[PDB]
Design a protein around this ligand. Sequence first.
Ligand SMILES: [Mg+2]
Ligand SMILES: [Mg+2]
Ligand SMILES: [Mg+2]
Ligand SMILES: [Zn+2]
Lengths: 361, 68, 38
Amino acid sequence: INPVNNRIQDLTERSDVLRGYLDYDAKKERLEEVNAELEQPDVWNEPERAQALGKERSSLEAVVDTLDQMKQGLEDVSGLLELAVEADDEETFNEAVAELDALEEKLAQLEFRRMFSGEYDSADCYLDIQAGSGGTEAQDWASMLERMYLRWAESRGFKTEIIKESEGEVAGIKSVTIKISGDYAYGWLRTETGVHRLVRKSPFDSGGRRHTSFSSAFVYPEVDDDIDIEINPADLRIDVYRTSGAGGQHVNRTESAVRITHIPTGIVTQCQNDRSQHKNKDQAMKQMKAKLYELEMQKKNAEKQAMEDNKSDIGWGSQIRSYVLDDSRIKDLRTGVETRNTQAVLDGSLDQFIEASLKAG
Amino acid sequence: TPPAAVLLKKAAGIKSGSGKPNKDKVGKISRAQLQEIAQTKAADMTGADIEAMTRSIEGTARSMGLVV
Amino acid sequence: MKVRASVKKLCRNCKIVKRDGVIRVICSAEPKHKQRQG
RNA sequence: AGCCAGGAUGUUGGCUUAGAAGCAGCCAUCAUUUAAAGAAAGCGUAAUAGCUCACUGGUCGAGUCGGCCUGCGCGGAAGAU
RNA sequence: GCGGGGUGGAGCAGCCUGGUAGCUCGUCGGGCUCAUAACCCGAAGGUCGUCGGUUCAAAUCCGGCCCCCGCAACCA
Ligand SMILES: [Mg+2]
Ligand SMILES: [Mg+2]
Ligand SMILES: [Mg+2]
Ligand SMILES: [Zn+2]
């Protein structure tokens, strides 16, 4: 009974948090404004505007109608639970439990969408850990982070495989790439991207001075390889002509040199090494395919380089979470969430920070 | 009279019952309930014999997906 | 006018008519259906 | 063939959809009013609507339909004194 | 067109002549050290590119297919 009341209060807080994160008053006002616009005849004068307003009204209606139905369901469940508890009706109690479970599943579906709106949140992920300023201490700290993340993945039931792991010579690991597989693994892990600051008594310094070390965790989603596309012949212009320095009656007369131009891109390849126009055309086709592939690889490498440039320097100012063991405090700078059970967090109790970050969005 | 489909849903106690009807039955209704539903709409319904109205409502429910 | 080798009735309003030794499809409903064999 | 009537009801069958009313589909696809009227064959509407049409009645009064085998033809069919 | 190759994680042997996989580094465990390297003592790891054939039996012999190399590609 009391756990059921606690569940009801948690669902009430969850619904209020959903309403406030979504600004239910703002969404309701926007929906009413869209309704007024749509009732006005001039709304359909622009078909794109009318369809946009219809889609917006459908989304706002989903959210608003779901919340309006959910509030009433919770109130009704509360009343039915009061009646069942008062009358000592076990069947009604079980029915209320089933209804509360169904409503909790509904709210959980809504809050799951809210937590993972992102397109790739459902994909598996890769986690890269790199040591930073601490040197050997940073490498040790990176190994500790790797252990923590593996333990958290095991808690969540994901499957992990070390793609690679460079080990520091004195201690720890310089770097590690880990593959995490599971349901919304990238969604759950993406908020952990950043630099992690560690403060303790350096277990390497001879004097045991209180030092600071940094380690970076970078999470990126697993990506399917690009489907190869055949070069559409309609996209190519082929020119045959005489080769330069043509020596002899035959060579002067024959059109052996081939040039292929990709109309969409403008990239041109040319071959005239062989006496046969067919061989030259085949080689030029190979070169054109290679050049298109090289262009796409160059674009992908440019995006990767942009990600590398964007990555926060693993240094003294950049930190998403601070783990001070001497003070026995762990604080997330972004969300403000603070804990004192450093041992539990290092053993893998990251759900507090991860859930807080997802809720904050 | 109010539309028949909403009354059918109300009698059932189901919300969505049309997806893949013959492949797997989502809901099911009883004939007596259908007949009781029919008799209330007799003012607007086009017929004298209530039996015809009842079987018409049965067919409507079958189209909706719920097997009688 | 679609000029092609295979001229056919595309809807129920199309009619096959031979004018001056040429098969033509004239449609009272859809101007796109107008065809000439050639 | 035209031509004249008609060409209904539950019911917009429900879902998924943004909307889905025969006519995006999915998806069932029935019974009722009977002369007959499709949970629609096409056109059409953002959706309806609307336009047909299938079906059926009534006037006119001899053919009409669309396959099979076969003879001969027609298009497809643009080149450099 | 004519020649070569593809074998523990890396580089090389073993093929010829069918029966049997080696070396060096690397990896792992224990030592030494305050600790790391070096060093010392032990271990593990390749069913031989991929299919097929031949054979009692194939890394080995034969034939495809894939990858990599060389050459050759002329008068014209
Ligand atoms: Mg001819
Ligand atoms: Mg052997
Ligand atoms: Mg020469
Ligand atoms: Zn037509």
